[PDB]
Amino acid sequence: PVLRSVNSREPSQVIFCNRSPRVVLPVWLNFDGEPQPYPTLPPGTGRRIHSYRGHLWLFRDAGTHDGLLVNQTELFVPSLNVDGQPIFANITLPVYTLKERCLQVVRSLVKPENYRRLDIVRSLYEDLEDHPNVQKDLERLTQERI
Amino acid sequence: MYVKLISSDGHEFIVKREHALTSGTIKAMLSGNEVNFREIPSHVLSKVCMYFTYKVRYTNSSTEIPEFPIAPEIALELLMAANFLDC
Amino acid sequence: MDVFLMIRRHKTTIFTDAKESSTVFELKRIVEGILKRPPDEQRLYKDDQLLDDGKTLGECGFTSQTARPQAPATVGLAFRTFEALCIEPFSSPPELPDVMK
Ligand SMILES: CC(=O)N[C@H](C(=O)N1C[C@H](O)C[C@H]1C(=O)NCc1ccc(-c2scnc2C)cc1)C(C)(C)C
Numbered sequence: 177p178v179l180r181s182v183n184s185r186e187p188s189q190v191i192f193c194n195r196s197p198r199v200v201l202p203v204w205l206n207f208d209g210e211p212q213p214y215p216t217l218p219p220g221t222g223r224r225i226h227s228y229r230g231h232l233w234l235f236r237d238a239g240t241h242d243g244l245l246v247n248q249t250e251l252f253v254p255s256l257n258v259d260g261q262p263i264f265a266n267i268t269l270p271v272y273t274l275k276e277r278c279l280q281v282v283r284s285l286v287k288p289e290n291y292r293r294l295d296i297v298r299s300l301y302e303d304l305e306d307h308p309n310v311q312k313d314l315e316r317l318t319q320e321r322i
Numbered sequence: 323m324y325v326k327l328i329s330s331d332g333h334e335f336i337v338k339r340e341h342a343l344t345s346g347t348i349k350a351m352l353s354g355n356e357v358n359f360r361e362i363p364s365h366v367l368s369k370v371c372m373y374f375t376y377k378v379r380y381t382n383s384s385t386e387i388p389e390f391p392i393a394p395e396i397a398l399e400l401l402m403a404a405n406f407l408d409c
Numbered sequence: 410m411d412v413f414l415m416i417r418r419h420k421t422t423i424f425t426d427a428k429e430s431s432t433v434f435e436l437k438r439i440v441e442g443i444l445k446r447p448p449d450e451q452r453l454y455k456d457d458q459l460l461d462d463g464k465t466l467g468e469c470g471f472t473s474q475t476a477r478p479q480a481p482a483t484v485g486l487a488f489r490t491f492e493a494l495c496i497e498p499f500s501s502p503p504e505l506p507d508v509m510k
Pocket residue numbers: 183185192202204214215216217223225226227228231
């Protein structure tokens with residue numbers, strides 16, 4: 177795959193800093209591009225972690241899989257540490273569209289089997305059902321890269 | 323310039339024109355000073371206006387982005403309004 | 410630093426921002442430009458407290474922390490004998506749907 181960690185074996189220490197109000201799930205893309213879940217970060221916390229140069233990470237809301245930003249972009253790639261300094265991965269909320277924010281709230285209150293009972297047009301039912309997904313995002317980022 | 327957005331229950335919301343242009347629908351209506359939303363009530367339209375303020379303030383900003391709050395009781399109607407307004 | 414407001418009278422609500430160091434009188438000049446009523450024909454309030462022309466918005470309680478873009482603070486407005494301050498509430502949301510409980 178285009179999006180995958182490189183097996184560099186070159187250590188890089190990183191500080192994951194959750195500057196969001198969400199519980200953050202760090203996601204590591206393995207050497208075949210398959211995403212792997214790592215321990216979650218509570219809001220406003222920082223974790224010093226051992227990663228490697230050329231590895232790829234993305235960050236989501238742990239409970240809903242909403243996309244989050246890391247250093248203002250989608251993907252985080254550690255580089256070599258300079259003078260023993262760790263690399264910062266500042267995780268933040270994007271400015272979601274109002275429509276996406278509303279879909280997040282409604283999904284959080286209604287079981288998918290009960291989306292059918294909501295008095296909304298069919299297109300909004302389709303929008304609710306189209307949950308955020310790491311596989312879908314990796315496909316999109318793959319096209320954006322090419 | 324300011325523009326007036328009127329709710330179904332007659333509240334008039336006066337907002338900066340550039341902020342109302344956050345909505346693609348409102349932008350098109352103003353292309354192409356007052357718009358009447360016959361199906362959007364004031365408990366929803368007031369929240370839409372807060373969203374415009376939030377979007378303009380925080381888009382391409384470096385300062386920490388806070389959550390945009392939505393009470394469960396308004397979420398369904400606010401979703402319908404956001405879908406119509408394209409914002 | 411900016412402060413984010415809703416200036417409200419009857420069923421009119423103006424969304425605007427102002428510097429925390431700007432004054433009550435300068436906010437009446439903003440209202441004038443929008444609603445075409447001069448400052449002497451306006452009374453501005455924070456809750457039922459009448460605000461003094463010479464105080465800054467910060468000195469009245471409107472600060473960056475408490476008057477946020479996504480949760481603006483309300484400034485009440487009454488026009489001129491002055492009418493009583495009267496802000497109509499926004500509509501009541503319907504009962505929460507069964508599938509959201
Ligand atoms: C040489 C190499 O590439 N090793 C990999 C490796 O060690 N990795 C891959 C990523 O770069 C992350 C790194 C790793 O597993 N480090 C240990 C680790 C443990 C906990 C955490 C986290 S994330 C949030 N909280 C914690 C405690 C982060 C990293 C594995 C063993 C998975 C093949």
